[PDB]
Symmetry: D2
Subunit: 338 residues, 4 copies
Amino acid sequence: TATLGINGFGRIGRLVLRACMERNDITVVAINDPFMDVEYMAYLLKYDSVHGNFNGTVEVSGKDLCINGKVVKVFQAKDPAEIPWGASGAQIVCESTGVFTTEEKASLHLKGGAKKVIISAPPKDNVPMYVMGVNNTEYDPSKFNVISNASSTTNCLAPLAKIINDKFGIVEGLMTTVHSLTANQLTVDGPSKGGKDWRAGRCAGNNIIPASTGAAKAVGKVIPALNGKLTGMAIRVPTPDVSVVDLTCKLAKPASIEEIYQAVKEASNGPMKGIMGYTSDDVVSTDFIGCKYSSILDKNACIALNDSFVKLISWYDNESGYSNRLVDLAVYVASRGL
Amino acid sequence: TATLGINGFGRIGRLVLRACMERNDITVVAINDPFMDVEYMAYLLKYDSVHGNFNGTVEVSGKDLCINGKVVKVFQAKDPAEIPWGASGAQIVCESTGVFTTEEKASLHLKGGAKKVIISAPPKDNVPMYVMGVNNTEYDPSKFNVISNASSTTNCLAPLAKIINDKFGIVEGLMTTVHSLTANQLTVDGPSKGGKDWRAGRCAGNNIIPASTGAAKAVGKVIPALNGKLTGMAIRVPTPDVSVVDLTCKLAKPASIEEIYQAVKEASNGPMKGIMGYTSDDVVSTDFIGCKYSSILDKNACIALNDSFVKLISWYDNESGYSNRLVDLAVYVASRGL
Amino acid sequence: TATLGINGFGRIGRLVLRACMERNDITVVAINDPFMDVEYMAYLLKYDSVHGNFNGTVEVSGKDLCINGKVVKVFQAKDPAEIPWGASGAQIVCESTGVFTTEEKASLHLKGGAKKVIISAPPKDNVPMYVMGVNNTEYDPSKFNVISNASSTTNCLAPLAKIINDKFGIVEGLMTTVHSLTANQLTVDGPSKGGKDWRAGRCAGNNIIPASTGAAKAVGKVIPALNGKLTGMAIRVPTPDVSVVDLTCKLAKPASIEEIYQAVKEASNGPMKGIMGYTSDDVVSTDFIGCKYSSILDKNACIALNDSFVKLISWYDNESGYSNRLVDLAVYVASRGL
Amino acid sequence: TATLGINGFGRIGRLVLRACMERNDITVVAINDPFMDVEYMAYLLKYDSVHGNFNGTVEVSGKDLCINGKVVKVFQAKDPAEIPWGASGAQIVCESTGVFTTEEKASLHLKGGAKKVIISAPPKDNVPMYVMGVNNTEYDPSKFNVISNASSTTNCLAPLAKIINDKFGIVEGLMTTVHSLTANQLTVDGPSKGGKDWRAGRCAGNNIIPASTGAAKAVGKVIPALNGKLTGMAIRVPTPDVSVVDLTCKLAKPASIEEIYQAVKEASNGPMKGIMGYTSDDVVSTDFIGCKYSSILDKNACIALNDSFVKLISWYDNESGYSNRLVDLAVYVASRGL
Ligand SMILES: NC(=O)c1ccc[n+]([C@@H]2O[C@H](COP(=O)([O-])OP(=O)(O)OC[C@H]3O[C@@H](n4cnc5c(N)ncnc54)[C@H](O)[C@@H]3O)[C@@H](O)[C@H]2O)c1
Ligand SMILES: NC(=O)c1ccc[n+]([C@@H]2O[C@H](COP(=O)([O-])OP(=O)(O)OC[C@H]3O[C@@H](n4cnc5c(N)ncnc54)[C@H](O)[C@@H]3O)[C@@H](O)[C@H]2O)c1
Ligand SMILES: NC(=O)c1ccc[n+]([C@@H]2O[C@H](COP(=O)([O-])OP(=O)(O)OC[C@H]3O[C@@H](n4cnc5c(N)ncnc54)[C@H](O)[C@@H]3O)[C@@H](O)[C@H]2O)c1
Ligand SMILES: NC(=O)c1ccc[n+]([C@@H]2O[C@H](COP(=O)([O-])OP(=O)(O)OC[C@H]3O[C@@H](n4cnc5c(N)ncnc54)[C@H](O)[C@@H]3O)[C@@H](O)[C@H]2O)c1
Ligand SMILES: O=C[C@H](O)COP(=O)(O)O
Ligand SMILES: O=C[C@H](O)COP(=O)(O)O
Ligand SMILES: O=C[C@H](O)COP(=O)(O)O
Ligand SMILES: O=C[C@H](O)COP(=O)(O)O
Ligand SMILES: [Mg+2]
Ligand SMILES: [Mg+2]
């Protein structure tokens, strides 16, 4: 049985834990977050403004947590090299702080006894990115101890892009993601951390906010065939969770929406089971809260100008979908030998 | 001096009156809305959740309103034919109820003595649509008594699309508008009137909602050279006002974002003054509340995959910009001979 | 097994159905809503913006619904007298349209063969109101075929007010409910139905809105001793569901927050089991989404100025709590003989 | 004519500057904020998600700001003792960081050459609190160099409470402020600064949140006659600005709503001109955006159980009202002799 440690018990951290508690093939044994004592961790696990009450029991046992009868070790270290992952029995670390997105910083977990690290974001350096159901089998345990699970937007775009490119071929494409607000945004107009993303510091609750994203370009790394063929941007909106990819692309081979839907349907029921999904219902964002899929094609929202120029709409719970993929990746990493 | 009568004193109706009160070449003399008495009309004009307190004075005088010391006649007729526009001295009618969008229905205003009618929406029939700064000079007063000012999204897309098509040429394009909520949407999950737009009946405050726009369906009629070359959809978001056009197009002639920006700049400073605008600041939706422009290019938000495949971002206050254009059109109609 | 018909398949109607599907002692056999065809009904049951996906199977069977294998007859009558409740097998009718809140109107269901009617609101006339755990045993089947379940705020206030009046006595009290938005409110500034409530017609998503509450007049009818001793108002806020009672009262006998907490705890574990609840956690509104209790005392939020003047805080899911009580009442009504 | 320096260029900091720009008897000459450079300061002043575009011109002139032709010196010091206020010619410092709320910390501005300091919050120590129109004349320049303008809620509650206590007498009272979100709240579920106030770290956009208010302890210090007779709490809601005081109190002398309204009217037109206001319109929160008053009585929303037990409703723009008062206090302080 694979074991997990979580660094940064935030939106992704807590939902990764929730996903692990639902599974027999992986166990959470340790959590680290210096901005959060044990009682606070219990509170933030028990209660969730988006995903409801924790399904199970959460108690404080001295310095640690007792979750569903299992002991989970709790630490409050600011530096990753201070956390005793090995002694806690944690083989794999979910690096979900948002502040250690390089090999240099994320590899500090290995000093504490960790065997492997998964950065819950695209890296700032050349740490390899893997998307489950797309390129995860490319992972080489002899060459990497620190890997990345990319972004939730990449996890939404890449499986759809693979299906479309395999079947019809993408000549060129531009993506917008209409994305729910995140932790780096602010409740009222203020300065963004580092002063880099000025728009992201504007009142999150009443604004439509343009944003940059490398997600579409990152698909060019996950799927080398699409290097230089895809890019895009983000538009941030006041909703607390769930986002949607809007992909406008030109196809090398003509295809109708129905044919695109069928290609997605066959992948969803076959090689991309549990990763790619589809719907023909009149869905809205809240309908996907808690959805474990990486990408859900919205048939009725797709539009075609002609047989070669199309706009594809795909949903994703940026919190829940991604968290389940990270857990999938951890389980897969363990199966390849630690 | 043109005189205006307003049918449907709603979001557009009330902001059209506000735009008139700012101008010396047009006067509002009559208002009809059967779902609000004079006291209620006074209240809804005085107070606005988006555009602030009315700039001036509003008083009830008997059965009518006194706005900035001027008498404005008030009626409560469900039937357009029953409104005495002529006896009230109203030459042009702003048809902004949302329920009389055909020549057959909108022409009923002519029975009461109105000379011309402007439908505040795209028509359900073949009523001619005009967009200020694009095709408005094509209006023939001897041919048409009922015209349309199209939609707010059309007024955003058409000026930009014309500029791009003229200098670079649009081979093919697809658009999305990330659009603020409107009066037809619902506060909680319920049935949409007529039971047609199921998604639009879902809780507006916490949902990202795919929708229709018919704006590129309208831009093709306003700019015949683009008919069949553009289509689009909408994504409805919880914000109370201000929307954004996201236009992804292939260009006939290669162009950089800088060159595109320069073309928009030249049009904004010349033939499309007051209609097309541009910015290089890190703006968000609230920054455009009250903005009178039809279309504002967001330079920093635009992205290009290559020299001939681009995603262009243009803002619009769907309430304020459109209302100002409708008043512009009414003044223009009056100048052509009533 | 009691059988239920639902008139008005709205927020309350649908959640009443959901509450029944969770139960073995009551079954929904018929639904009536003229503004909603059977396909739309299926859609609105399947998907909920607050309470998630329907847990079960919903299919259209002719003009009727098939839910978890059972046929639920569907009608589209505007006139209650035209609904064949008897032929459908429906014993008790949930009157949840919001427009038939008198004995004269609600008794029309009896013409179609229904035995009993529960109005899902305070009546406009003298139809008796019952609150589970407070006065429901005063119901007399030989006297009344039409009854009321009061309001959600009444169901929150009444159990708490009873506990306080029994143990300590209420000299006088004033309350406010900070209340989530409802169906009667509007997405943008517009006219409310009729002359009623101008404030309620203001943009729901960005306003704090003073309002009225049914519990102001209902509480003194449910607990006659408090008639003239207790009244209040509402403050409407942008949240989609869950509300909170803010009760400020003078006690006839000295009591601390601890003593008040204990009295509530005793009632919650005794005669008001499943109805009155309590918490000592740092809860917020979303933590109560789906909560079945009528009233949950928030210990940490309560404040005492002195030993006889106190502010009590009590949560309630205005949709889920009330819907469960109406079903509780229906089961109780059937147990008394139809 | 006073000169002002601003420490902490946040919501209050920037709106204090905006208030100053509207007046000719006070001038901002310096700003310190280590979390934003001069370009970022210019951006956050120019654009506001609540209060609109800045009325005037904002230019970056090398190191410093040029606002309406006036040079404003810009600093980036974390330590208040390192800011050269004297060299910049700043007489009075607006201490609006939220982190220097003691005499020991706030008096550090005097080291850099400032003459007086106004903390934009209730102090953690015994620094004297003043509310304009309530107790500001008790200020003596020969006694204090460091003072406090209390809080926004204190500035709403105190004038109202004074009027009622002077006219009728408050025996006992409890209040709640339904309060817009602030900078200390979070966009999604997370850990609050420090480690306490867990509820304030919950998703601000979709929650009703019990909270603390500065006015609970401050009101009894500003009006000593009400010490131990008045306290309360806050309820935080998703709106970006504007809050409302809900005051439930018992009176020593019988008084109707009309009599209370007339007493407020007298004060508003007399000793509390520009501080206390009143309305009989069906107002909602957005109607007070930019309102300069400290407290606006909502006549229609007030309720009386009997002639001596009453609930009073008073609005305030927590940003605009308070900011104008701090500027009023700075001007008053200057008039008394620096
Ligand atoms: N939609 C999403 O939220 C989403 C989806 C996919 C990936 N991600 C990525 O996952 C990462 C975290 O995202 P999030 O939304 O959960 O942010 P978050 O703010 O909710 O969680 C971050 C947690 O890290 C903790 N932390 C900060 N410094 C730490 C340290 N030095 N050591 C240990 N813990 C520390 C913080 O206390 C916080 O609880 C980011 O890289 C983000 O880009 C986010
Ligand atoms: N962003 C926008 O809101 C926007 C922008 C451009 C165009 N439009 C179009 O303008 C029209 C109105 O839009 P809105 O947002 O102002 O809607 P609205 O609901 O705010 O206003 C419609 C008004 O019409 C009144 N009305 C209904 N029946 C009437 C009748 N029989 N006679 C007179 N008045 C009647 C209603 O009482 C209401 O006040 C629609 O066609 C809409 O598509 C809207
Ligand atoms: N928090 C709440 O939502 C809440 C809580 C307690 C009680 N209530 C009360 O319950 C009632 C319904 O409230 P709601 O929030 O569900 O409103 P709603 O608008 O969501 O539901 C009302 C339903 O009644 C239907 N309807 C209208 N006329 C009808 C008719 N003639 N015949 C059959 N159906 C008709 C409408 O189509 C709609 O689906 C109201 O009386 C309300 O005061 C509401
Ligand atoms: N409704 C309100 O916002 C409101 C109303 C009345 C009073 N207040 C009080 O006013 C103060 C500021 O509140 P705010 O809402 O403007 O918060 P804010 O976060 O918007 O502003 C605080 C500013 O202080 C700056 N800052 C932090 N450390 C600094 C330092 N060491 N030196 C100089 N600047 C520093 C931050 O960068 C930020 O720009 C708080 O004490 C608050 O309680 C707030
Ligand atoms: O957490 C902030 C990230 O920008 C979210 O992006 P993502 O949803 O693409 O991972
Ligand atoms: O609500 C309607 C829009 O403001 C008008 O534009 P659209 O319908 O073309 O998107
Ligand atoms: O929607 C209204 C409430 O849920 C019902 O209770 P109230 O009317 O007594 O506040
Ligand atoms: O807007 C007000 C500030 O957030 C603090 O005020 P308060 O603590 O007195 O409510
Ligand atoms: Mg991303
Ligand atoms: Mg059942």
